[PDB]
Design a protein around this nucleic acid. Sequence first.
RNA 1: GCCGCCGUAGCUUAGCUGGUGGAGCGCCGGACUGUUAAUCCGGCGGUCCCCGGUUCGAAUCCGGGCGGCGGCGCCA
RNA 2: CUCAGGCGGGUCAGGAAUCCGCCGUAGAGUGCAAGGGCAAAAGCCGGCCUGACUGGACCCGUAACAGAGGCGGGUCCAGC
RNA 3: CGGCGGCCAUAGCGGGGGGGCCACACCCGGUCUCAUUUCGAACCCGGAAGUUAAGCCCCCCAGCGAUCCCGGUUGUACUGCCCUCCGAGAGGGGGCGGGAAGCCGGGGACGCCGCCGGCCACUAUC
Lengths: 95, 197, 186, 168
Amino acid sequence: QKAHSFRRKTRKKLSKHPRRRGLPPLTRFLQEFEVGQRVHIVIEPSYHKGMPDPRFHGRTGTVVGKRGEAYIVEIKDGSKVKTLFIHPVHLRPQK
Amino acid sequence: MAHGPRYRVPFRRRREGKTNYRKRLKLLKSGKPRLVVRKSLNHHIAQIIVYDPKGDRTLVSAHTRELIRDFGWKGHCGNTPSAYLLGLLIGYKAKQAGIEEAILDIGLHPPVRGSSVFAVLKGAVDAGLNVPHSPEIFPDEYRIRGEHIAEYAKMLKEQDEEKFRRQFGGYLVKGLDPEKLPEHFEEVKARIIEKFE
Amino acid sequence: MAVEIPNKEQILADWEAHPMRRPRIEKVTINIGVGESGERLTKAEIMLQQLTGQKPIRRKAKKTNRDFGIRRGEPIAVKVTLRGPKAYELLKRLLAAVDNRLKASSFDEHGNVCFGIEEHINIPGVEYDPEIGIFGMDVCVTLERPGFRVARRKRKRAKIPTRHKLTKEEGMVYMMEEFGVEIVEG
Amino acid sequence: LRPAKIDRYVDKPAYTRREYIRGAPGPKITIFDMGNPAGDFEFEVSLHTAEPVQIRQNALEAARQQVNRYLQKNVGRSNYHFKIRVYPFQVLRENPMATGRKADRYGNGMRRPFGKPIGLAARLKKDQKILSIRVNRQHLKFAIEGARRAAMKFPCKCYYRIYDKEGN
RNA sequence: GCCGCCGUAGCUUAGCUGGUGGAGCGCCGGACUGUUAAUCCGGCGGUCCCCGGUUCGAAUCCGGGCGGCGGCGCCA
RNA sequence: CUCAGGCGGGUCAGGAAUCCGCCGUAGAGUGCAAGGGCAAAAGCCGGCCUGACUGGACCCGUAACAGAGGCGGGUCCAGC
RNA sequence: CGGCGGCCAUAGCGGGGGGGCCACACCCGGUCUCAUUUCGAACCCGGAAGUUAAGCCCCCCAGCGAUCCCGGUUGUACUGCCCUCCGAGAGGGGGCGGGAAGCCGGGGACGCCGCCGGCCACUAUC
C-alpha cells in the first residue's frame, strides 16, 4: 500500500489497549471447539503464536478438525474457500 | 496498570504472589489432571484437581489433619515424612476414584531434590499411581524413614546447657516424640493400599 | 529538648503493644567502592576478609570511564555482607570509630545509616598494618522491620504499607540503644 | 511570501506534526501576552470567528501589532490585558517556480512538487476566540476599535462580531 | 532549482577504523649581530564551521543549517 | 531474577565505576528502520546443549477476492 | 480464616478499627538434603520456646484512579439516504434513518463468582 506484507496496516488490529496489555489469560488459549462449530477468529495481540494472517480478523468460519495442537477452520474469503490454521487462543465460540 | 489507565492488566494471583499463569497453562495443555502439592509452614496438602471454566473441581483431597486422625500419625505435620504418608493417603482414593494419572504441580518454587514435593510424589508412586517422572529426584532413604533427625536431636537438645553440645533452639521440644522414631513411621506406612494392610 | 525525646517515646510505645512492632538490623555491608584495584585484584581485598571473618566477593566494572571502570569486567571493589553475631561484633567497635554523637544528618529516610570513614578502623594488630597498609571503606547498615520477610520470598509477595516500613524516628534510638549516643540538638 | 489564497480554506489537510517531518519552519510571532495579568479585570471582550480559515503566522503578528500598538499608546500598559490565544501549527507547502523562461521550465508539474516549508498557520473554525482582550468599562471603547482593525486582516470575515462575553 | 566537494592553531594545508592532532607561515620570549635583517634556540592557542542524533565516547559516521568550488540551466 | 529515571545516606572538585535503602506499569531492553508484541518475560543472569536435524505432507502468503513461477511461513505426522 | 480457580482495577492508592489467628506469619536451629562469584538473605532440611505486631481474615471510609447510572450540556458534536433545495466559493439546511467525548450536579463502587478442606463443626464462620 506502500508495501505488501501481512502486518501492513494492521497497527490497530495487532495492538491491544494499554489496559488489556500483559500476557493474555490462559482460558482463551485452552478453549475447545467442536467440529460443525462456528468460531470467530480474532487475533489476540498479546499472544505471538497461533496467529492467522491479520486480514482475516473478524471472520467467522467452521472448525473442520485439527492439525497438531491447532484447529483447522474453514472460511470463505470472498469467492474462495480457504483454510485457516489457528490455535484456540484466537478463536472464540459463536453465540 | 498503576494509578492511571496505563500499560498491563494485573491478575488476582499476580497481586497475591501465587502460581504463575504461564506455568499452569503449560501443565493444563495436555488434558491431564494436576496433582497439586502445596506447602505451608506446618501443613502439606495434596489434591487431584481438574480444570473447568467454572473454576477447578477437586475430585479427592487428602490433608495432614485428616491423616492426624485415625492413621496412627501423631507426628509433626510439617516434616518431610508427613508428606510421604500424604501421597499414600491420596493413594487409597485413587483406587476408589480410579484416576491414577496426574502431573506434579509444585506451583512456583525451584525443583531440586531433597524437597517436600519429591517426597509426596515418592509416596504416590509406591501407593501405585502411574504419573510421569524420571527417577533422579527422590530424597535419600534417611530422609523418608526419619532417622536423620534422631541423630540430630542427640547432637543438640534444649533445656540442658553444657560445654558439650547441648545447643539451644529447635530439636523436638515435644515429649511424645523426643526425637522421632522411625518405628512410628513404619506403623502408619503399614496402612498402605486400600486394604489397610 | 528535641530529636531524642520524640523518637524514644514512640519506640517505648511500640514495646507496649508488643515488640514485634519494633525494627531489627538486617545486615552490615562493609565495602570499598572508592577503589584501589585498578585493572588488578587489590590487596585491600585480604584485609577486609580477616576483619569480617568470612569470604569476600569481587566487583567487576562496567563501561569505559576516566578514573575507575576503565575497562568492562576489571576488579574495582570488594564487599562482604555480614549477618548474625559477626555483624554485631563489627558494629560495637565500628560505632566507637565514628565520632560520637551519631549524626542525624547521615540518616536515610528509611531509618538507615551509612558511614564514610576511610583509613581508620580499630583493633590492633589487624590494623596497623605491615607491610600492606593501603585501605578505605564505606559502611552501610540496613535496618528494616522483622515481619518484612514474606515480600522477600516467592510466596505471598505483595506490597508492604508504610505503616510497616521503618522511618527516621525509630532508627536513631535503636542505634543508640545498642552502643554510643546520638546527636541531640536543643 | 505569496499572497494568501490557500490560507482561507480548511478543506486542505493536515501536515502539522513538526517532529515527524524533515524540515520545519521558524515562527515570526514571539509575543502573545502583553500588559498586566488577567486577574485584575472583570470584563472580557472577544473577537469571534464565524468562518473557517487558516490564519498565517504573518497575519497573526501584523494584526496583533497594529492593535496592540493602539492600545499601548492611548491606554498604556498599566491597564488592559490582551491575548491572542492561538499558536499556528499547520505547515504550509510550495511548488517550486520562478521566472527563467525560454527553453527552461520553472515549472514543473511533479519531480517533487511536495512542499518546502513556507510557514505555519492556525486553524480557526466557528465560534473560536481569535482575540481576547480584558478591560474595565472605562476602557471599553478602545478594545472595540482595536477589534474592528483585527477583522479586516482576518482571511475571510467575522459575522459574530465584537462580542461581550460579558465576563462570566 | 538540481547533482558533487569543503571549512582543521591568526592563515594556508596534512589527517581521522569514531578514543588521535600536526607541518610551513605569521606572532611571542631569549640568543648571535655594533644595531638589524638573515640565522639560531623556547613556545603557545585548534569546542578540527553551526546544530541535531547514535555511541560508553564523534574532530571522525549519519540529519539538518551557513558561507565558499565545480558541473546542467537545454533538443524545446 | 526485574528495569530506565528520580530521592535520601556514601566516595569525589564534580563525576564515574562501585555501595545501601526508597519510589518507580514499562520512559528500559529485546542486533539493525519503523511499527506491533512482551515484566513472576521473549528482557536480565547462569548452566546445559546444538532441531539453523532427516523425510514426507496440509495450508497460507507470494499473486486478497481471482489464473501466478521462484522464494518464505504456520501447522502435522514418522525418524533421530 | 486453608488450597485450587473464574471474572480480571467495581478486586489501583491511601487510611481506621477488631481478631471469634490450633490452621496462616513472624520466630528460633541451621548438623544434615540444599541456596549464595559474599551472607540461612535466597534455597532448602529442622522446630515452636516466644509475637498478633504486621501480613492475614473480617468490619468499614473515596480525597486520588477506574467502573456504572440518572439528569444537564445534548438529540448537541458528527453522520447514511434524497434535494432543477440554499451559499460566489468555504459551506449549510430540510425530510428520512442514526448519534460520541470531554465536563457539571446527584448517586452506586475500597469486589463478585465456582470446587475442595479444616479446630470448631457436622451448620457456617474467623
